[PDB]
């Protein structure tokens, strides 16, 4: 009964750690598309 609870705990921790990564990922994707838009507008105007 111990080895299962400790196991269920690990699982909820990994699951928790996963939601974190999927959010961190989404946020990093927005940051990409923004540095894209910024860089392009600057080049676009340097010509």
């Amino acid at each position: 009964e111990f080895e299962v609870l400790a196991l269920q705990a690990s699982l909820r921790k990994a699951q928790m750690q996963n939601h974190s990564l999927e959010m961190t990922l989404e946020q990093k994707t927005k940051e990409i598309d923004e540095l894209t838009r910024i860089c392009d507008d600057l080049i676009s105007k340097m010509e």
Binding site: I32, T36, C39, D40, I43, M46, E47
Partner: protein, 101 residues
């Protein structure tokens, strides 16, 4: 249908943003380390080389060149690329904005 890429004076990819996948089909890792001329149509390579020779001489101002790019799907895509060096005064790199037309 636009992506940025920085190169060395020799024309070798040293960075390319992920919009290249959607544009020419290649992953960034597939392009990194290779010379852009390797992907260029034989008839246009001289024209493209001549571009990389002059941006270096001008140091600052912007050139533009039209040439065919062989995509991952193996078809010749017309690319209008605008180029210019970045000064620190030697040269750090050549940036390019490749646009499919």
């Amino acid at each position: 249908t636009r992506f940025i890429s920085r190169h060395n004076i020799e024309g070798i990819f040293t960075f390319v943003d992920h919009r290249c996948v959607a544009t020419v089909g290649y992953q960034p890792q597939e392009l990194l380390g290779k010379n852009i001329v390797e992907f260029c149509h034989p008839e246009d390579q001289q024209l493209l080389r001549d571009s990389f020779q002059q941006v270096v001489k001008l140091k600052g101002q912007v050139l533009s060149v039209m040439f065919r790019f062989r995509s991952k799907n193996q078809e010749w895509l017309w690319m209008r690329t605008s180029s210019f060096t970045f000064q620190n005064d030697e040269i750090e790199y050549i940036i390019c904005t490749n646009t499919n037309v």
